[PDB]
Amino acid sequence: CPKPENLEADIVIIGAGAAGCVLAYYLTKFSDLKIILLEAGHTHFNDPVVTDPMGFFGKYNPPNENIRMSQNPSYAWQPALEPDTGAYSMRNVVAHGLAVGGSTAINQLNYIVGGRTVFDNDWPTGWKYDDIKKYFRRVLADISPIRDGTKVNLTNTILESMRVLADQQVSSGVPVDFLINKATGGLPNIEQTYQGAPIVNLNDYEGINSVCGFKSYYVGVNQLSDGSYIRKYAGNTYLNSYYVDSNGFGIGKFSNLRVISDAVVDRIHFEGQRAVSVTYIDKKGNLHSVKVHKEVEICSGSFFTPTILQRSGIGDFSYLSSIGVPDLVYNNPLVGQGLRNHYSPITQVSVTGPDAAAFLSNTAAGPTNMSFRGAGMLGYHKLEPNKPSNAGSVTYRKYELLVTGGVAISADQQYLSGISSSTGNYFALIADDIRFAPVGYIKIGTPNFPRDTPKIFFNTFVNYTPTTDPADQQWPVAQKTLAPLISALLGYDAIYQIVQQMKVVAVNAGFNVTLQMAYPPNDLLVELHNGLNTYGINWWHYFVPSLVNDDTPAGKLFASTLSKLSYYPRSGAHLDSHQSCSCSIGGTVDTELKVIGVENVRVTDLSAAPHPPGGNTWCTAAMIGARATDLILGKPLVANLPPEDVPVFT
Amino acid sequence: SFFTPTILQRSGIGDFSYLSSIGVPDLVYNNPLVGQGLRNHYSPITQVSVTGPDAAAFLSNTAAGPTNMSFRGAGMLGYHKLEPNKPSNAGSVTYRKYELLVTGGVAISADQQYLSGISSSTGNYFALIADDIRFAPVGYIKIGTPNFPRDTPKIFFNTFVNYTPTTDPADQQWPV
Amino acid sequence: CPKPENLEADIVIIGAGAAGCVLAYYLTKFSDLKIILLEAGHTHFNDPVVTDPMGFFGKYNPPNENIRMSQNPSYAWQPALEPDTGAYSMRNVVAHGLAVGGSTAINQLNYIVGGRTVFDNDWPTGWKYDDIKKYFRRVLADISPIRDGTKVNLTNTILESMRVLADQQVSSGVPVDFLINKATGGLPNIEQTYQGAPIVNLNDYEGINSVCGFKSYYVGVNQLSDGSYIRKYAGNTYLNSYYVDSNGFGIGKFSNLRVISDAVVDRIHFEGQRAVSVTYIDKKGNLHSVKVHKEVEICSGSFFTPTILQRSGIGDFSYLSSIGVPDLVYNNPLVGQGLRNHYSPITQVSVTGPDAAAFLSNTAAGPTNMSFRGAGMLGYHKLEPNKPSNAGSVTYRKYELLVTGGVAISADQQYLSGISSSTGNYFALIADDIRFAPVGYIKIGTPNFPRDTPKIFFNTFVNYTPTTDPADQQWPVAQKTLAPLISALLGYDAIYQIVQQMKVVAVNAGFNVTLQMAYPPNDLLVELHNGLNTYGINWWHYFVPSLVNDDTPAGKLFASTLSKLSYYPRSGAHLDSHQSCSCSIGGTVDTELKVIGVENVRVTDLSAAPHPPGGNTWCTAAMIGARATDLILGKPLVANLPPEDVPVFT
Numbered sequence A, C: 001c002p003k004p005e006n007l008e009a010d011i012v013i014i015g016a017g018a019a020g021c022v023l024a025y026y027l028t029k030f031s032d033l034k035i036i037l038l039e040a041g042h043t044h045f046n047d048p049v050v051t052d053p054m055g056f057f058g059k060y061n062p063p064n065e066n067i068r069m070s071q072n073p074s075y076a077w078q079p080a081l082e083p084d085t086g087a088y089s090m091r092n093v094v095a096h097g098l099a100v101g102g103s104t105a106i107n108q109l110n111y112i113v114g115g116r117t118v119f120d121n122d123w124p125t126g127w128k129y130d131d132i133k134k135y136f137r138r139v140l141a142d143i144s145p146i147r148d149g150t151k152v153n154l155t156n157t158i159l160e161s162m163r164v165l166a167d168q169q170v171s172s173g174v175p176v177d178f179l180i181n182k183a184t185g186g187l188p189n190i191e192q193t194y195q196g197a198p199i200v201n202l203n204d205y206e207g208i209n210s211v212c213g214f215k216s217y218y219v220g221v222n223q224l225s226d227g228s229y230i231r232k233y234a235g236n237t238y239l240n241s242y243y244v245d246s247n248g249f250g251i252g253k254f255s256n257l258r259v260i261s262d263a264v265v266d267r268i269h270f271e272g273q274r275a276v277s278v279t280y281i282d283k284k285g286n287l288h289s290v291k292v293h294k295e296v297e298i299c300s301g302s303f304f305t306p307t308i309l310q311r312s313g314i315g316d317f318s319y320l321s322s323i324g325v326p327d328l329v330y331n332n333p334l335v336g337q338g339l340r341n342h343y344s345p346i347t348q349v350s351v352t353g354p355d356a357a358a359f360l361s362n363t364a365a366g367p368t369n370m371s372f373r374g375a376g377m378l379g380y381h382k383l384e385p386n387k388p389s390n391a392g393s394v395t396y397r398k399y400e401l402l403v404t405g406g407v408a409i410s411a412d413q414q415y416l417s418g419i420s421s422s423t424g425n426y427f428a429l430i431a432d433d434i435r436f437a438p439v440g441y442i443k444i445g446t447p448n449f450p451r452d453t454p455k456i457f458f459n460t461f462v463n464y465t466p467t468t469d470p471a472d473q474q475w476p477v478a479q480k481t482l483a484p485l486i487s488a489l490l491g492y493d494a495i496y497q498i499v500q501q502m503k504v505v506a507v508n509a510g511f512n513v514t515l516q517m518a519y520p521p522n523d524l525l526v527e528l529h530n531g532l533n534t535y536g537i538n539w540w541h542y543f544v545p546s547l548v549n550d551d552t553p554a555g556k557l558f559a560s561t562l563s564k565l566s567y568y569p570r571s572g573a574h575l576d577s578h579q580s581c582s583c584s585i586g587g588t589v590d591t592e593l594k595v596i597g598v599e600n601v602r603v604t605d606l607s608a609a610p611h612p613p614g615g616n617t618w619c620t621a622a623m624i625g626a627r628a629t630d631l632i633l634g635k636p637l638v639a640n641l642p643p644e645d646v647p648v649f650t
Numbered sequence B: 001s002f003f004t005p006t007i008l009q010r011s012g013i014g015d016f017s018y019l020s021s022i023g024v025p026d027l028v029y030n031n032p033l034v035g036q037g038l039r040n041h042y043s044p045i046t047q048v049s050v051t052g053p054d055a056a057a058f059l060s061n062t063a064a065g066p067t068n069m070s071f072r073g074a075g076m077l078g079y080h081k082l083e084p085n086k087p088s089n090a091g092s093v094t095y096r097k098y099e100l101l102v103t104g105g106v107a108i109s110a111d112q113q114y115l116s117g118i119s120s121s122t123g124n125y126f127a128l129i130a131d132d133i134r135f136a137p138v139g140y141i142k143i144g145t146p147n148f149p150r151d152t153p154k155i156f157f158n159t160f161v162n163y164t165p166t167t168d169p170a171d172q173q174w175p176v
């Protein structure tokens, strides 16, 4: 049976995403083992729409196919989730990149590293902050992001307003407002606003800043000697022409490395409890089998790691037998469970003034800010019942705030609201959830070949139906069910209570302008503010009006207002693309990242995270891959590599 | 419909430039029309309110059984009087345009249900559907990866597009 | 001496330009000989600035290096010609492309095939029109150009005017006006102007149209299924991924073909009168020697074919010995002699009217017209003394007319004239010379390595200095010396006498507008028109005022006007990039394209043309290469290949 594609080795890494390349690179650098990478994708080093950062916004799109890279089946997998019973049963498609570099070839390029507190309070032993912060330093040094290269006065006004009201939040003694950081003290952690003001680094090495108002992010772009920016991503850095031949061999130093471009993997041939081989389909349609000697690594992303595991034989035996899996290995009913993701409701602001163009200048997107102009990361609101115990003594990251010019609601909402993108006296504010509550799971549907869409369940904004139970002991399930909608409403109020300090700051900053939230409607926010400050910590009793027993017309007003307000976060919002926690630590893998019930396979992508980090989930996956390098190799080498040693660029 | 042109294109029949572009190694016949000319129906929905104290007597025996499957008529109609897009034979032959359907309850989508202020709980409401059988828009199908049959290939279908006027005199831009 | 780069074979083709790829492709297709191509250049299949046709105009240029491809030493050779004694001693740089596909990778993509009469009256035996027209059909079928995809009313107005005045030129019995074609008869050869008017094909198979007014050209672009156009050039078609491996091997059918990407050739190692080997420098800087068994082919372009010949040993023995050539083979004092090129003086038109934007719409450049909107090809003017004998019985192509929106004079001239490119009531007309008179030559300067700039002499608009000789028999050297300046002046008058028919046509075409030539100045053209029609065929006596002996103030007026007018074609013009005739037939090679004095080398690029064709010189070089395929192979195979057999595109 003459197949000369004998690619037997000792380590096989599957999926060259944000974590696959880091591992393959630093694994062939520090040892002599024979390494193989399989990705099922070519290298888009020459594509203008990839390498140019501004191509993300559709600059190179043919006029008849104006879709960008997340909606393009030639660039990204297209999985759709089953009807969201919390969002009027609207199915959604969220992508995972299909190329060297994974989703980093198609993403927005932001570098939130996540707070310090999360890795100290939500991760297992060995994964506390002080065990990994060095790895975060390693990756941010390997990329070297940059800051915004353009000033603007709107950032100054907004930072002014936030410090103004953080002054009061510092007083009044309440301990859990959203602008209090405990690692600084009485002084607010708000960046100064004047020429020669220093810059507060969000991703600081010692994690002092978990709540801070700044002016710019750190995007993963570099400037070339010519004057043009390009994209600096995982495949760009760790796997470029200098390190790997066009035929897939490494060069000299890394001669013990093999990369196959287009090879879709199906499952893991598995003798006993010992993985022994892997098969894949090349671009004819042939099945090639390769031996594994020493270990197998799975870096296939959040959606497609549990899936390949389940086809392999690890999962729920009853289910996999039901749908027709012939070979069964380990009976873990938790594989593909506990899926987590962020979520960002959207609001926009109207400015009334004859010459407000002077106010909104220098807001357009360049390859250094990518339309991001701030503003800060906030903590828990004062009136949110779902806070951990440590909230009295440690500050947690809850909301990530973003400001952007133009309007960003969906087109149907644009038409409905009466405000369009043509006019230029409008801008958008976003209060992202980082601690988003809902949880889902992933189930395969056919044991034949890797399918683009497996069963993915994710219900977010569900409702609570009261029972005949006495009110006293049914409240603490209403709390658990209504957490996310409460969080979104509190984000709305938090953004709302900024615009008045912004009014004052603009008035005495040389601007006769007026600021106002028009989406959601003005009245529907003033009423929420009044209801909050008149009903206190028991404001959220009124989501269910049959239990408050408050038949006063004021109570009916509050119930109706919350009913209407519950509509906006369902439709006028944007599910993010930060999928994580499919095979988390403890649930499916141990703290050394090995799969329970087997001795020589590990999962090391973002699916293995036991909690979503404090922001955009790119650094985290690379950190996990980097740490996996050490755990596989045995001794810390990437650990204290000097920071001046960085991969060369080509 | 969706997966015949796709297996053809992976096989080697299609647009040689495109299949070579995305990496098809073996090419057989150069037909640039494979996967072109996709057609489908489309059914806008409307619903009716009945006002009356004992209208339950009016709406009885409308529930779905395995013999009617919630269908209660009503007929198939031809072209409207005022539709400019009719074939030449319309003067001498009758064409099928609309398929009419009546059904109890409400059938708009849930978000529209909330928006309109009328829900499915109440029982003095029913739905009428005027389906298009001669639906105009046309699309096409293109594969995206020459490896294995994928669930989602590139499918393009734009229905209710709009017309943007040009500086051309009005007289000879109407028939586009 | 261990050099494993043993690339000994029987045919070696040097330079993959507009003629190298055609030959290599169709030569490995129809035989079994071992073929090698050397180009010294990589393949720009992925570069956006190359493949996108609109990239020619600088759409992908970094803001700090805004130069396009002809001025870029990484894309094109940069030879500069010695001071032009006719153009105020202004040196000029004209480029030859440096890539697979040669100048076709950087050109404007036009497909004039040239008239029929030229190949019948100016080429040797065996190269008359009916011997090659099939080869022209072959190349135009191999490319499949397209037409303009956008109407415009300016083309209709101009064609209207030309037919109006061609009506009169048909009458009055004069035989040599510029709008008379003899293969049609009394009816003008002017394309009809209304909806459903047929299209006159300029490049018609039987060559009936040598003078004709049309509306669109044939550019070498294709439309992709997506909606984006790309560039279809020599390397794109004959040497693409489907035919050649990334390692330079051919595939299956063409397995007997080798292509080396970056290999600069120096000279031809030459045993006896028999070429035996060739050396080249790779991208280390190493010298690799390859054996030749059977024949050597030179396709290195107009500027660099005679140069490599001279370094090889063929040329003027005294000169090559003088500058230090050690090995001398054949003493041909004509190598590198007889250089020819086109030349296009420029004029622009002002339109006065309140709403002339309605007149000039739909003139912007798209990848189908590339800013070309006509207009036609004309013959000799009535009053040009330098016409061949056959002018009474055959119509010759003299001027190629072009219309374009915006202004195209050089920047210094823009400032001088007081009219800039910002304003939008102005457009350009160009009367190109196809029969341009001046001739030059090429001489190497150092026998070490191929140099970018060898001695290139080209003097165009020289002046005549009278002697003491009696006037009677010194006129017919003044004629020969003043030919090109006379031609340019007559082109000016020809364009001038169009604008009044354009006035009438616009007046009764629904337009209240006014047309006027502002560059060169209005008065300086009206005076030329009056002088022409008052002095007749002896209008050109007045270039030299010391011989006319006409001291009348009218004669002084005429002399001064011609003196001033002689300034514009010198500076306000554009030397084209159609270099040809360096090793023409008879001068340096026989009719079977072999080099005199040697048995197994040929030159087959555009340098071997014994006359410049009737238009843009791209089809001609490809035709020469195609015919060379037959002469080398011996029997006509590419001759009657069916036109439905075309190279597949990837």
Ligand SMILES: Cc1cc2nc3c(=O)[nH]c(=O)nc-3n(C[C@H](O)[C@H](O)[C@H](O)COP(=O)(O)OP(=O)(O)OC[C@H]3O[C@@H](n4cnc5c(N)ncnc54)[C@H](O)[C@@H]3O)c2cc1C
Pocket (backbone or CB within 6 Å): A014, A015, A016, A017, A018, A019, A020, A038, A039, A040, A041, A070, A095, A096, A097, A098, A099, A100, A101, A102, A103, A104, A106, A107, A108, A109, A110, A111, A112, A263, A264, A265, A266, A299, A300, A301, A302, A304, A308, A450, A577, A578, A579, A605, A606, A607, A616, A617, A618, A619, A621
């Ligand atoms: C639309 C979008 C927006 C984003 N925005 C941001 C942002 O603002 N900030 C930020 O920091 N990050 C952003 N990201 C990136 C994202 O948050 C993380 O970078 C992502 O989780 C990367 O983690 P990963 O490497 O584990 O996943 P991936 O990069 O998806 O790794 C999966 C890899 O495995 C391959 N693979 C999958 N299945 C198979 C199989 N069967 N066989 C072989 N190979 C396979 C895939 O092709 C891919 O190369 C965005 C991503 C997207 C898609």
Ligand SMILES: Cc1cc2nc3c(=O)[nH]c(=O)nc-3n(C[C@H](O)[C@H](O)[C@H](O)COP(=O)(O)OP(=O)(O)OC[C@H]3O[C@@H](n4cnc5c(N)ncnc54)[C@H](O)[C@@H]3O)c2cc1C
Pocket (backbone or CB within 6 Å): C014, C015, C016, C017, C018, C019, C020, C038, C039, C040, C041, C070, C095, C096, C097, C098, C099, C100, C101, C102, C103, C104, C106, C107, C108, C109, C110, C111, C112, C263, C264, C265, C266, C299, C300, C301, C302, C304, C308, C450, C577, C578, C579, C605, C606, C607, C616, C617, C618, C619, C621
């Ligand atoms: C600015 C510009 C504008 C043009 N505009 C038009 C137009 O409007 N219409 C039109 O029809 N054509 C146009 N052309 C194209 C031009 O008129 C012809 O296509 C050209 O003569 C091609 O002929 P060729 O193949 O013999 O020359 P080339 O294409 O130049 O062939 C020479 C080849 O040999 C290689 N070579 C040279 N020296 C060496 C060496 N020492 N060793 C190895 N390789 C070597 C070169 O890199 C190149 O690949 C334009 C070209 C340019 C540069």
